[PDB]
Design an enzyme around this catalytic site. Structure first.
Site, short mmCIF file in Angstrom:
data_model
loop_
_atom_site.label_atom_id
_atom_site.label_comp_id
_atom_site.label_asym_id
_atom_site.label_seq_id
_atom_site.Cartn_x
_atom_site.Cartn_y
_atom_site.Cartn_z
CG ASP A 141 33.09 -14.05 -10.42
OD1 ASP A 141 33.73 -13.53 -9.49
OD2 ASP A 141 33.34 -15.19 -10.86
CG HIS A 168 4.47 -9.75 8.15
ND1 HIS A 168 3.43 -9.06 7.57
CD2 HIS A 168 5.35 -8.82 8.58
CE1 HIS A 168 3.67 -7.77 7.64
NE2 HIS A 168 4.81 -7.59 8.27
CB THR A 206 6.97 1.81 5.88
OG1 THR A 206 7.37 0.51 6.30
CG2 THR A 206 6.45 1.74 4.46
CB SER A 215 16.72 3.86 -3.54
OG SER A 215 17.38 2.63 -3.79
CB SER A 272 16.39 -22.34 -4.98
OG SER A 272 15.04 -21.99 -4.70
CB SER A 273 14.84 -19.13 -1.00
OG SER A 273 14.56 -20.12 -0.04
CE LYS A 318 14.10 2.47 2.27
NZ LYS A 318 14.00 3.40 1.11
CE1 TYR A 338 7.03 -4.59 5.47
CE2 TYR A 338 6.46 -6.51 6.71
CZ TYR A 338 6.24 -5.21 6.39
OH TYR A 338 5.20 -4.57 7.02
CG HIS A 358 -0.44 -8.59 10.98
ND1 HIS A 358 -0.94 -9.08 9.79
CD2 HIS A 358 0.84 -8.22 10.72
CE1 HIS A 358 0.00 -9.02 8.86
NE2 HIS A 358 1.09 -8.51 9.40
CG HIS A 359 -1.13 -12.68 8.39
ND1 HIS A 359 -1.80 -12.45 7.20
CD2 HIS A 359 0.07 -12.06 8.27
CE1 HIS A 359 -1.04 -11.73 6.40
NE2 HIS A 359 0.10 -11.47 7.03
CD1 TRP A 376 -1.98 -17.47 -0.29
CD2 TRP A 376 0.17 -17.91 0.11
NE1 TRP A 376 -1.49 -16.46 0.50
CE2 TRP A 376 -0.17 -16.71 0.76
CE3 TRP A 376 1.48 -18.38 0.22
CZ2 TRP A 376 0.75 -15.98 1.52
CZ3 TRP A 376 2.39 -17.66 0.97
CH2 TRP A 376 2.02 -16.47 1.61
CG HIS A 408 -3.34 -16.45 -8.95
ND1 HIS A 408 -2.58 -15.97 -9.99
CD2 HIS A 408 -3.88 -15.36 -8.35
CE1 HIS A 408 -2.65 -14.65 -10.02
NE2 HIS A 408 -3.44 -14.26 -9.04
CD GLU A 423 8.42 -15.01 0.72
OE1 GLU A 423 9.39 -15.34 1.44
OE2 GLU A 423 8.48 -14.96 -0.53
NE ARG A 462 -8.28 -13.68 0.84
CZ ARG A 462 -7.01 -13.71 1.25
NH1 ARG A 462 -6.55 -12.85 2.14
NH2 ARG A 462 -6.19 -14.63 0.74
C1 HEA Z 1 4.62 -7.04 -0.20
C2 HEA Z 1 3.38 -7.25 0.16
C3 HEA Z 1 2.88 -6.64 1.41
C4 HEA Z 1 3.27 -5.45 2.14
C5 HEA Z 1 4.30 -4.36 2.02
C6 HEA Z 1 2.34 -5.44 3.30
C7 HEA Z 1 2.39 -4.45 4.25
C8 HEA Z 1 1.57 -4.38 5.34
N1 HEA Z 1 0.57 -5.28 5.62
FE1 HEA Z 1 0.07 -6.88 4.59
N2 HEA Z 1 -0.44 -8.48 3.55
C9 HEA Z 1 0.11 -8.94 2.40
C10 HEA Z 1 1.14 -8.36 1.73
C11 HEA Z 1 1.75 -7.22 2.15
N3 HEA Z 1 1.47 -6.49 3.27
C12 HEA Z 1 -0.55 -10.17 1.92
C13 HEA Z 1 -0.06 -10.83 0.66
C14 HEA Z 1 -1.58 -10.48 2.89
C15 HEA Z 1 -2.59 -11.59 2.91
C16 HEA Z 1 -1.95 -12.96 3.07
C17 HEA Z 1 -3.12 -13.89 3.29
O1 HEA Z 1 -3.88 -13.58 4.23
O2 HEA Z 1 -3.25 -14.92 2.61
C18 HEA Z 1 -1.43 -9.36 3.85
C19 HEA Z 1 -2.26 -9.30 4.92
C20 HEA Z 1 -2.21 -8.33 5.87
C21 HEA Z 1 -3.18 -8.38 6.97
C22 HEA Z 1 -4.23 -9.42 7.25
C23 HEA Z 1 -5.63 -8.86 7.21
C24 HEA Z 1 -6.52 -10.06 7.38
O3 HEA Z 1 -5.98 -11.19 7.38
O4 HEA Z 1 -7.75 -9.90 7.55
C25 HEA Z 1 -2.79 -7.20 7.72
C26 HEA Z 1 -3.34 -6.70 8.99
O5 HEA Z 1 -2.59 -6.52 9.93
C27 HEA Z 1 -1.65 -6.59 7.02
C28 HEA Z 1 -1.05 -5.44 7.44
C29 HEA Z 1 -0.01 -4.85 6.78
C30 HEA Z 1 0.61 -3.62 7.30
C31 HEA Z 1 0.07 -3.02 8.57
C32 HEA Z 1 1.65 -3.28 6.35
C33 HEA Z 1 2.65 -2.18 6.29
O6 HEA Z 1 3.89 -2.63 5.74
C34 HEA Z 1 2.19 -0.98 5.47
C35 HEA Z 1 3.16 0.16 5.74
C36 HEA Z 1 2.99 1.29 4.75
C37 HEA Z 1 2.28 2.39 5.04
C38 HEA Z 1 1.65 2.54 6.39
C39 HEA Z 1 2.14 3.49 4.02
C40 HEA Z 1 3.46 4.24 3.84
C41 HEA Z 1 3.75 4.98 5.12
C42 HEA Z 1 3.30 6.24 5.29
C43 HEA Z 1 2.55 6.92 4.19
C44 HEA Z 1 3.60 6.98 6.57
C45 HEA Z 1 2.34 7.62 7.13
C46 HEA Z 1 1.37 6.51 7.46
C47 HEA Z 1 0.99 6.30 8.73
C48 HEA Z 1 1.54 7.16 9.83
C49 HEA Z 1 0.03 5.20 9.07
N4 HEA Z 1 -1.35 -7.28 5.89
C1 HEA Z 2 2.66 -11.24 -6.48
C2 HEA Z 2 1.73 -12.16 -6.59
C3 HEA Z 2 0.51 -11.89 -7.38
C4 HEA Z 2 0.26 -11.21 -8.63
C5 HEA Z 2 1.05 -10.50 -9.69
C6 HEA Z 2 -1.21 -11.32 -8.78
C7 HEA Z 2 -1.86 -10.79 -9.86
C8 HEA Z 2 -3.21 -10.86 -10.04
N1 HEA Z 2 -4.10 -11.45 -9.21
FE1 HEA Z 2 -3.71 -12.36 -7.51
N2 HEA Z 2 -3.32 -13.29 -5.82
C9 HEA Z 2 -2.11 -13.46 -5.23
C10 HEA Z 2 -0.92 -13.03 -5.72
C11 HEA Z 2 -0.80 -12.34 -6.89
N3 HEA Z 2 -1.79 -11.98 -7.75
C12 HEA Z 2 -2.23 -14.20 -3.96
C13 HEA Z 2 -0.97 -14.48 -3.18
C14 HEA Z 2 -3.63 -14.49 -3.78
C15 HEA Z 2 -4.34 -15.22 -2.67
C16 HEA Z 2 -4.28 -16.71 -2.98
C17 HEA Z 2 -5.34 -17.40 -2.16
O1 HEA Z 2 -6.43 -16.82 -1.97
O2 HEA Z 2 -5.09 -18.54 -1.70
C18 HEA Z 2 -4.22 -13.88 -4.99
C19 HEA Z 2 -5.56 -13.95 -5.17
C20 HEA Z 2 -6.19 -13.42 -6.24
C21 HEA Z 2 -7.65 -13.59 -6.36
C22 HEA Z 2 -8.60 -14.20 -5.39
C23 HEA Z 2 -9.21 -15.51 -5.82
C24 HEA Z 2 -9.79 -16.04 -4.55
O3 HEA Z 2 -9.06 -16.59 -3.70
O4 HEA Z 2 -11.03 -15.96 -4.43
C25 HEA Z 2 -7.90 -12.87 -7.58
C26 HEA Z 2 -9.15 -12.61 -8.32
O5 HEA Z 2 -9.92 -11.82 -7.83
C27 HEA Z 2 -6.61 -12.42 -8.11
C28 HEA Z 2 -6.51 -11.73 -9.28
C29 HEA Z 2 -5.33 -11.29 -9.78
C30 HEA Z 2 -5.27 -10.56 -11.05
C31 HEA Z 2 -6.55 -10.30 -11.79
C32 HEA Z 2 -3.86 -10.27 -11.22
C33 HEA Z 2 -3.05 -9.60 -12.25
O6 HEA Z 2 -3.23 -10.34 -13.46
C34 HEA Z 2 -3.48 -8.17 -12.49
C35 HEA Z 2 -2.90 -7.69 -13.82
C36 HEA Z 2 -1.39 -7.55 -13.79
C37 HEA Z 2 -0.62 -8.22 -14.66
C38 HEA Z 2 -1.27 -9.16 -15.63
C39 HEA Z 2 0.89 -8.07 -14.64
C40 HEA Z 2 1.52 -9.26 -13.93
C41 HEA Z 2 2.84 -9.58 -14.59
C42 HEA Z 2 3.75 -10.34 -13.96
C43 HEA Z 2 3.43 -10.90 -12.61
C44 HEA Z 2 5.08 -10.70 -14.57
C45 HEA Z 2 6.19 -9.78 -14.06
C46 HEA Z 2 7.51 -10.31 -14.58
C47 HEA Z 2 8.49 -9.46 -14.90
C48 HEA Z 2 8.26 -7.98 -14.77
C49 HEA Z 2 9.80 -9.97 -15.41
N4 HEA Z 2 -5.61 -12.76 -7.28
O1 PER Z 3 1.33 -9.52 5.56
O2 PER Z 3 1.40 -8.10 5.84
CU CU Z 4 1.56 -9.94 7.62
#
Ligand code: HEA
Ligand code: HEA
Ligand code: PER
Ligand code: CU
Ligand code: CDL
Ligand code: CDL
Ligand code: CDL
Ligand code: PEE
Ligand code: PEE
Ligand code: PEE
Ligand code: LPP
Ligand code: K
Ligand code: ZN
Lengths: 141, 226, 75, 147, 107, 141, 459, 62
Positions: free
Chosen positions: G90, G228, G303, G243, G152-153, G306, G232, G277-278, G125, G60, G230, G428
């Site tokens: 193109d 991380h 962030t 935008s 590919s990426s 924006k 972003y 932070h992970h 994953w 998943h 990734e 988890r």
């Molecule tokens: C695209 C996906 C995405 C994005 C944008 C982010 C954004 C951020 N993530 Fe991430 N993060 C994940 C995807 C993402 N993350 C995933 C997938 C994991 C788990 C991976 C795994 O463990 O397997 C993860 C895990 C993860 C952890 C791990 C927690 C743990 O392992 O127990 C933490 C903690 O530091 C973290 C922090 C953040 C922070 C601080 C931001 C910042 O970018 C957020 C910034 C945005 C805001 C802050 C809000 C908008 C800003 C404002 C409204 C301004 C005013 C706000 C303030 C002044 C605070 N992320």
């Molecule tokens: C972007 C990536 C992505 C997306 C879309 C989702 C979508 C969803 N995920 Fe996600 N999920 C992950 C990334 C994602 N997840 C990752 C990275 C983990 C951690 C893996 C790990 O633990 O090792 C995770 C883990 C995770 C768990 C934890 C299982 C566990 O480890 O114990 C669960 C269930 O609770 C869950 C549920 C769901 C559900 C219910 C939806 C969605 O079904 C919710 C409903 C939304 C939709 C059905 C729309 C989705 C449609 C598309 C994605 C297609 C878009 C295409 C076009 C627009 C062209 N996810």
């Molecule tokens: O990963 O934030």
């Molecule tokens: Cu991170």
């Protein structure tokens, strides 16, 4: 009155500008490398430097400098034999230059000179010069 | 132009092996019926025949001299077309910057088709606005909705054809008196005698008029191995 | 006539236009005295650290003519 | 000032009429340049030597006619007659008499607009200015309200 | 920041006392899915699609000039749906400056 | 220079933004009309006014950038340019000389000394009773 | 032809098509997870087949990240509009563009084939060793897929970078968004490849990096140094889309264009230096923890700028324009949803809070709100905006208020309860859990089945 | 560049139209169905048609 003309350059990618008809005629005339020839004039400083690379050319270049000759390099290799003709050629060109320059405006008559000694001209189209890039020494001596 | 790559050898001159072998017909073909290679060698043979005859140059008018060398006397019609052609080519790899367009003097947008995409950035300084893209189709005086800058499309079209240097030369240049092969022979004997060829193009050209292989050394010149 | 050997002519200047290139005021053309002072200090620190290996462990006993609040008691 | 001074295209001459730089593998023939300078004379030295174009004297009357019809062209033609025109002098002459192509706006066909429409140009401009005035004022008004 | 074009009071003075702001509708019209005729083949349906492009439409003002369909980005300038080859003639982004040269004018 | 830069080291096309300094301003000048005096009101716009080949300077720049590609001789650059062209090559060659005549000799001396005294001549002899050459870079200890 | 086509716009369509296909497998796996978690007991997976659940969660995550959202937001919309936005005929590298999509498909086939043929086990994953290196051959197959995907990426990133050399117009914010993601890929991917090769060496070449005297924490550093960046690389293209949509639909010029651009650049630099932070709970040094916590909180500044610049884009827009279009609703919903995800990210950024919330479903809900809700909706909104240009039909989405409302409500029913169980606490990557966590797990499960049903109504 | 890919080319005329033996114009497949049901509502929405224009987009029940 001189009309303007279009002058184009390039074969597949062509760039067009406006130009002078007389300037274009001169340009094409100078492209006739067999007819219009570049000629070299030396000075004592440069003649001496030539010896650092070709001793024979230094001696022949010195002869050309001593007589104040504007000479082609190919002819310079045969200056020993061509010298009497080159001196005669120098005189005739000078006569012609003087006559044309001194003529009143609108007078475009040909100058009177002995063309048989001027090369390249219809009267004397030149000589078939033999290549001189032949070693004549025995390495074991 | 900056977008063009490096001059080829052909951009300067063509090899004499590309000279048409039927010179007699080449010098009698109308300009509109001559191809690129045929037109190159018609002008070179005729132009060099007049330039290599010094005694006749002073009495030859610029109109006649330009005709012999194949140069087109410029006039307002042809200048307009050539200028817009070169402006189109320049804009291929260059920016599009100029004075603000008004009804009296619209921004001129050259195009070959009936449409070209154009963007208005407004005026200078604070009067500059974000790019507003629009499709500039022919026959409409366009006005930017933001700064009221007037635009207009100019089409390089003439008689079911677009504008090219070849088209401009064909439409406005007029063929003069038919080239006389006697002049070719006369100049040939002037600069080519006793194994000396000081008009190589006229030695090859005279050989073809004679039938190919007639002049000394020409059979050996035409005998190739691959 | 007189001529100049092209190999010993001076570099051509940048053209003076609306878009003119000028490096004269940058001072980035060559390493300056400061850079060579950094090299000298590096050599000095390298030699000193090896010659005098007890410098980092100094003696806290201090006499200091004119007391501690006199300028020559801070160096 | 491009490609290290090496011309992209240049002329080479060979003394032997039957010489081929690709078929032959001899080691005695020395190539010459466009002015005829042998290759064993370095560029730094040959470029100092002054080379001038010599046209046959039968061309002098033609070169004289060109100078008289175009007085600005006379000094260059005089140099050519007197055998004082170098390659640089020729280049100066060439670029001095090059002119840009001219475009005439009076020859451009215009998009069709009726005489009634042409008389309303001032009105439309007037509307545009009032639209810009109202736009600019509203910007201040809205910025104050929403912030 | 951009705040519109600058206006001088002289430019806001009408030539008649009845001048008001022109009330021209800038709604292009009523549209829906492009509706192809069954009789039309693939070639003729392509012509139909090319004749339904909103970005080829404009509004003509009282003086005969037309304000075209405009967009912030060039994505809205290609035919919809996008053809295989779009910008054959390079789209021209027009910049404005105050520089001029004498050759462009005649006295 | 090795790396190609459109603005400075443009050897692929040889384009130059400005003409040679040798040319008189009456013959050719850089394309700069920023100082043009205000146009009289009675003058009328004939051309497009768009920046392009209608301007004489720009036209001459394009023309020269194509006709400069054929030249009778080389434009000898000065020794400063030539040195810069192969700066890395010369420096690497001197680096090789240093590695052979400087690094080589003292490295050999150290190994020979190590043979007799167990440790290199620039190391502190140990008393711990461990055997072997030990470290070589003493200042990274 | 179909497979031979080099047209950049056709390839863009292929990327979206393949993302939906692979997405079906992704959603199915998600349904399996939520069904299992509906109560305590075994529901659809036997206790003797618990290894399958571990594989389900692993696949998943990997598929949704690398084979669905990344190919959709960085391969699909980019390949279709970027050359148009750049007013170029193109894409710069036509043949490379073709092979990139083919590579993605081939790596997908390898992964799914490994499900069918290999024994089904999972290691997350994040493929943490030593667990990843003591597994069966399915782990080897997954590694091959990731490496192939990496090829590919990177080549696609090279393709987009070359637009700077040919762009004939202005670099719009969206173009800046893709360029910076491309830079992030060029700098992060080579590090990932190295650590993946080391995983292979220990799996297949008898290497000993991840056995005693070798630090397993080493993998986590190199992995998350890509991990991380990734997240972003997956969000920045979404920001670029948001935008364009807001400016176009509201007929308002982007406000603070240069600040938007400089905010994207800033997020990238900062995102390249905050990876640990992970790794808060591993036992890093106090000063390291403080550095990473400090820099992680800084990312909120760019962030945040924006977000507020987007808000003013929607403010003040004309009322006469109909605001119920699905693309506009999704763009607005992104702002509302992203703030939730980001704020929770800042909460978890505090390491002491993180001790309690690491490896809990609070982290799940955090990155789902950003990706499963925010990124998905952004991709949908972008495709919807380009419906006329792309030309697809046979769906009822463009004006469907029911779909938007039902999606928003039900998606929140799934992940909002996952924040609660994070303080319950439910770890988890588990399938069985204590009976006192059923209520919230049940509510989220009801949300998952409902969302799937709403996906059928679009047709 | 002489003989290079043309910047612009005019479309050739479309192929000849096909009639049936009785003269009825030959129809081709068309995926724009007229669904059968009793609903006849028509919803109209003002839509962005660029920067300065709009279009009144209508959705018909059929
Ligand atoms: C695209 C996906 C995405 C994005 C944008 C982010 C954004 C951020 N993530 Fe991430 N993060 C994940 C995807 C993402 N993350 C995933 C997938 C994991 C788990 C991976 C795994 O463990 O397997 C993860 C895990 C993860 C952890 C791990 C927690 C743990 O392992 O127990 C933490 C903690 O530091 C973290 C922090 C953040 C922070 C601080 C931001 C910042 O970018 C957020 C910034 C945005 C805001 C802050 C809000 C908008 C800003 C404002 C409204 C301004 C005013 C706000 C303030 C002044 C605070 N992320
Ligand atoms: C972007 C990536 C992505 C997306 C879309 C989702 C979508 C969803 N995920 Fe996600 N999920 C992950 C990334 C994602 N997840 C990752 C990275 C983990 C951690 C893996 C790990 O633990 O090792 C995770 C883990 C995770 C768990 C934890 C299982 C566990 O480890 O114990 C669960 C269930 O609770 C869950 C549920 C769901 C559900 C219910 C939806 C969605 O079904 C919710 C409903 C939304 C939709 C059905 C729309 C989705 C449609 C598309 C994605 C297609 C878009 C295409 C076009 C627009 C062209 N996810
Ligand atoms: O990963 O934030
Ligand atoms: Cu991170
Ligand atoms: C640890 C391992 C390190 C391994 C190093 C490997 C180096 C391999 C190349 C070596 C080589 O041949 O260099 C000599 C040679 C010297 O060039 P030159 O033109 O002859 O120099 C003339 C003079 O030196 C005077 O030259 P100049 O000063 O006038 O300038 C011309 C030259 C000047 O440059 C050089 O000469 C480069 C020299 C490098 C030496 C390294 C040692 O320009 C270039 O060559 C530019 C090349 C392109 C650079 C692109 C940089 C991309 C990354 C940018 C950052 C992106 C992320 C930002 C993140 C943060 C955001 C806030 O260098 C090159 O031509 C190679 C350029 C490309 C190198 C890429 C390396 C990876 C990045
Ligand atoms: C003793 C032995 C000694 C040693 C011997 C050593 C010998 C060494 C040999 C070395 C070389 C061997 C390989 C040779 C390759 C030759 C390639 C070549 O030059 O072909 C030219 C050749 C040109 O053909 P042609 O003769 O001109 O005529 C072709 C026809 O007229 C057709 O015209 P067309 O090309 O326009 O039509 C193509 C197209 C026509 O389109 C359609 O069929 C309908 C439209 C599409 C429908 C929707 C499909 C789903 C959406 C996909 C969206 C993304 C598409 C991306 C682009 C396509 C990528 C394939 O449909 C297809 O054929 C494929 C469509 C996409 C299929 C995949 C979609 C996803 C399915 C996922 C299902 C599971 C979940 O290429 C082809 O057309 C066929 C290439 C086939 C390559 C197949 C490779 C498959 C690899 C699969 C994974 C392998 C590992 C696992 C396999 C497990 C199996 C149990
Ligand atoms: C240079 C140049 O000539 O560029 C144009 C030139 C193309 O010529 P052109 O025809 O003038 O281009 C038209 C413009 O593109 C069209 O541009 P425009 O006219 O619409 O706008 C004007 C301006 C618009 O652009 C600008 O003016 C932007 C200038 C600022 C860019 C951001 C700088 C970094 C942020 C600040 C860092 C501060 C650090 C402080 C540290 C303090 C420590 C004490 O144009 C450019 O600058 C275009 C070039 C932009 C290049 C962007 C390269 C990637 C930037 C990556 C940023 C950092 C990412 C960090 C990732 C994470 C790292 C851990 O670019 C190239 O040749 C592209 C080469 C790409 C190579 C990629 C592979 C490298 C390895
Ligand atoms: C009135 C003033 C007079 C001043 C006189 C100055 C005399 C200075 C003499 C200097 C002599 C230096 C000799 C150095 C010999 C080194 C031989 C050597 O090591 O050879 C082997 C070694 C490689 O050995 P490997 O087995 O591979 O082991 C090392 C790598 N694993 O080879 C090399 O290092 C090759 C290079 C040898 C360099 C020899 C240098 C000789 C220098 C002579 C200078 C004479 C200066 C005279 C000045 C006169 C002024 C009036
Ligand atoms: C045990 C585990 C082992 C893991 C091994 C991992 C191997 C990773 C291999 C990654 C290779 C990536 C190579 C990328 C090369 C650069 C790409 C690029 O931009 O090339 C462009 C250039 C030509 O551009 P055009 O598209 O034709 O443009 C035409 C108009 N001018 O392309 C090439 O020449 C590339 C040729 C090789 C193919 C590269 C892309 C496909 C991947 C190849 C993988 C090969 C190894 C397996
Ligand atoms: C983007 C390119 C620049 C990235 C720079 C990242 C540097 C971040 C600094 C983090 C820091 O303080 O490092 C500590 C941290 C380790 O901390 P502890 O395991 O607690 O050990 C400390 C004492 N035993 O350092 C690292 O892990 C550094 C990893 C190397 C990064 C190298 C990046 C190379 C980029 C090219
Ligand atoms: C990613 C890692 C990169 C490698 C490691 C980076 C280390 C940090 C960055 C160093 C970069 C240096 C580049 C070279 C610059 C250079 O030579 O720069 C040279 C400049 C001078 O410039 P000029 O060449 O123009 O003169 O040097 C200076 O400015 C200093 C002049 C000499 C000063 C002598 C006395 C110094 C006293 C210092 C006391 C310190 C006390 C500390 C107490 C805590
Ligand atoms: K369960
Ligand atoms: Zn405007």
């Amino acid at each position: 009155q001189v009309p303007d003309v279009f002058a184009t350059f390039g074969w597949e990618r062509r760039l067009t500008v406006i130009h002078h008809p007389g300037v274009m005629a001169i340009s094409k005339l100078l492209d006739q490398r067999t007819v219009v020839k570049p000629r070299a004039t030396f000075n004592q400083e440069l003649v001496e430097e030539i010896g650092d690379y070709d001793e024979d050319l230094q001696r022949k270049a010195q002869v050309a400098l001593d007589n104040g000759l504007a000479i082609e390099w190919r002819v310079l290799d045969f200056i020993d034999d061509e010298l009497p003709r080159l001196l005669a050629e120098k005189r005739e060109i000078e006569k012609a230059r003087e006559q044309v320059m001194s003529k009143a405006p609108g007078d475009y008559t040909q100058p009177v000179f002995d063309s048989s000694v001027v090369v390249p001209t219809p009267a004397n189209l030149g000589r078939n010069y033999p290549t001189l890039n032949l070693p004549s020494g025995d390495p074991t001596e | 132009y900056r977008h063009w790559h490096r001059m080829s050898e052909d951009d300067w001159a063509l090899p004499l092996d590309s000279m048409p072998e039927d010179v007699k017909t080449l010098m009698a073909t109308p300009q509109t019926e001559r191809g690129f290679v045929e037109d190159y060698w018609y002008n070179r043979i005729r132009g060099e025949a007049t330039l290599l005859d010094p005694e006749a140059l002073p009495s030859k008018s610029y109109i006649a001299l330009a005709r012999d060398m194949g140069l087109q006397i410029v006039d307002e019609p042809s200048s307009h077309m050539m200028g817009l052609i070169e402006l189109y080519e320049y804009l291929r790899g260059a920016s599009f910057v100029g004075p603000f367009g008004t009804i009296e003097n619209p921004v001129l947008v050259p195009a070959v088709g009936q449409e070209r995409v154009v963007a208005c950035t407004g005026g200078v300084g604070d009067e500059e606005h974000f790019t507003l893209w629009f499709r500039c189709r022919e026959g409409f005086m366009y006005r930017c909705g933001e700064c009221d800058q007037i635009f207009m499309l100019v089409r390089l079209y003439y008689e079911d054809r677009y504008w090219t240097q070849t088209l401009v030369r064909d439409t406005f240049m007029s063929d003069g008196d038919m080239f006389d092969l006697k002049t070719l022979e006369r100049v040939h004997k002037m600069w080519n005698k006793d194994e000396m060829v000081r008009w190589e193009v006229g030695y090859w050209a005279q050989d073809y008029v004679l039938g190919k292989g007639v002049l000394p050394g020409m059979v050996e010149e035409h005998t190739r191995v691959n | 006539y007189k001529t100049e050997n092209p190999l010993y002519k001076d570099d051509e200047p940048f053209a003076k236009t609306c878009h003119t290139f000028d490096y004269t005021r940058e001072g980035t053309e060559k390493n300056g005295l400061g850079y060579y002072c950094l090299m000298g200090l590096w050599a000095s620190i390298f030699i000193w650290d090896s010659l005098y290996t007890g410098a980092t462990m100094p003696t806290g006993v201090h006499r200091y003519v004119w007391g501690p609040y006199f300028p020559t008691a801070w160096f | 000032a491009y490609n290290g001074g090496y011309p992209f295209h240049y002329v080479v001459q060979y003394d032997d009429p039957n010489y081929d730089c690709e078929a032959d593998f001899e080691f005695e023939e020395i190539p010459r340049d466009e002015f005829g300078v042998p290759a064993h004379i370095p560029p730094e030295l040959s470029t100092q030597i002054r080379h001038t174009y010599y046209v046959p004297p039968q061309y002098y009357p033609f070169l004289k006619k060109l100078g008289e019809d175009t007085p600005e062209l006379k000094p260059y033609t005089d140099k050519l007659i007197m055998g004082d025109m170098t390659y640089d002098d020729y280049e100066e002459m060439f670029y001095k008499f090059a002119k840009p192509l001219k475009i005439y706006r009076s020859r451009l066909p215009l998009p069709y607009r009726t005489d009634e429409e042409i008389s309303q140009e001032k009105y439309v401009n007037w509307c545009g200015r009032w639209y810009s005035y109202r736009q600019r004022l509203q910007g201040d008004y809205y910025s104050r309200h929403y912030f | 920041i951009y705040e519109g074009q600058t206006v001088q009071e002289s430019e806001l003075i009408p030539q008649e006392d009845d001048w008001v702001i022109e009330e021209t509708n800038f709604c292009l019209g009523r549209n829906c899915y492009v509706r192809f005729r069954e009789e039309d083949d693939l070639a003729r349906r392509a012509l139909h699609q090319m004749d339904s492009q909103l970005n080829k439409m404009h509004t003509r003002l009282r003086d005969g000039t037309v304000i075209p369909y405009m967009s912030f980005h060039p994505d809205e300038m290609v035919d919809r749906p996008a053809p295989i080859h779009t910008f054959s003639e390079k789209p021209l982004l027009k910049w404005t400056w105050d520089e001029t040269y004498e050759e462009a004018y005649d006295d | 220079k090795h790396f190609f830069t459109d603005g400075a080291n443009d050897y692929v096309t040889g384009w130059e933004n400005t003409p040679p300094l040798k040319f008189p301003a009456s013959v050719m000048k850089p394309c700069d009309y920023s100082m043009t005096k205000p146009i009289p009101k009675h003058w009328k716009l004939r051309g497009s006014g768009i920046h392009g080949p209608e301007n004489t300077d720009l036209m001459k720049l394009v023309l020269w950038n194509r006709l400069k590609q054929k030249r009778p001789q080389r434009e000898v650059p000065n020794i400063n340019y030539l040195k810069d062209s192969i700066r890395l090559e010369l420096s690497v060659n001197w680096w090789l000389m240093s590695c052979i005549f400087l690094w080589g000799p003292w490295l050999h001396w150290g190994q020979e000394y190590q043979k007799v005294h167990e440790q290199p001549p620039w190391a502190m002899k140990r008393i711990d009773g461990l055997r072997g050459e030990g470290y070589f870079t003493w200042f990274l200890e | 032809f179909y497979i031979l086509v080099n047209n950049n716009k056709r390839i863009g369509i292929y990327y979206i098509k393949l993302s939906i296909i692979i997405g079906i497998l992704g959603i199915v796996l998600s349904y399996i997870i939520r069904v299992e978690l509906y109560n305590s007991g075994n529901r659809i997976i036997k206790y003797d087949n618990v290894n399958y659940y571990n594989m389900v969660i692993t696949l998943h995550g990997l598929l949704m990240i690398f084979y669905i959202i990344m190919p959709g937001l960085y391969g699909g919309i980019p390949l279709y509009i970027l050359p148009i936005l750049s007013v170029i005929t193109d894409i710069v590298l036509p043949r490379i563009n073709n092979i990139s999509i083919i590579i993605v498909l081939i790596s997908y086939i390898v992964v799914i084939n490994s499900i069918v043929i290999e024994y089904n086990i999972g290691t997350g994953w994040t493929l943490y060793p030593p667990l990843s290196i003591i597994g069966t051959v399915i782990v080897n197959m997954i590694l091959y897929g990731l490496i192939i995907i990496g090829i590919s990426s990177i080549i696609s990133a090279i393709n987009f970078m070359n637009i700077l050399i040919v762009i004939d117009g202005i670099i719009y914010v969206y173009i800046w968004s893709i360029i910076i993601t491309s830079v992030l890929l060029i700098i992060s991917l080579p590090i990932l490849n190295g650590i993946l090769l080391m995983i292979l060496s220990d799996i297949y070449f008898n290497s000993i990096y991840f056995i005693l005297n070798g630090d397993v924490v080493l993998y986590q550093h190199l992995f998350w140094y890509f991990g991380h960046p990734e997240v972003y690389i997956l969000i920045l293209p979404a920001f670029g889309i948001i935008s364009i949509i807001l400016s176009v639909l509201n007929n308002k010029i982007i406000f603070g264009m240069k600040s938007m651009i400089l905010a994207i650049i800033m997020i990238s630099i900062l995102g390249s230096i905050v990876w640990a932070h992970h790794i808060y709970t591993v036992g890093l040094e106090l000063d390291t923890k403080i550095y990473f916590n400090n820099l992680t909180l800084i990312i909120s500044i760019p962030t945040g700028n924006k977000i507020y610049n987007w808000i003013i884009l929607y403010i003040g827009s004309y009322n006469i324009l109909y605001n119920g279009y699905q693309s506009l609703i999704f763009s607005i919903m992104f702002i509302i949803i992203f703030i939730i995800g980001g704020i929770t990210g800042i909460i978890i950024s505090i390491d002491i809070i993180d001790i309690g919330l690491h490896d809990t479903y609070y982290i799940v809900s955090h990155f789902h709100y950003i990706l499963s809700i925010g990124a998905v909706i952004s991709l949908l909104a972008g495709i919807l905006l380009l419906k006329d240009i792309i030309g697809y039909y046979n769906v009822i989405i463009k004006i469907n208020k029911y779909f938007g409302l039902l999606l928003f409500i039900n998606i929140n029913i799934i992940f909002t309860p996952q924040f609660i169980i994070g303080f319950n606490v439910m770890p988890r990557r588990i399938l069985e859990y204590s009976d006192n966590i059923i209520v919230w797990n049940l509510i989220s499960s009801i949300g998952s089945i409902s969302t799937i049903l709403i996906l059928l109504s679009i047709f | 560049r002489i003989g290079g890919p043309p910047v612009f080319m005019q479309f050739p005329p479309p192929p000849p139209k096909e009639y049936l033996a009785d003269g009825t114009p030959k129809t081709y497949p068309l995926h724009q169905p007229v669904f059968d049901h009793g609903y006849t509502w028509e919803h109209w929405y003002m839509t962005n048609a660029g920067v300065f224009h709009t279009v009144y987009y209508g959705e018909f029940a059929k």
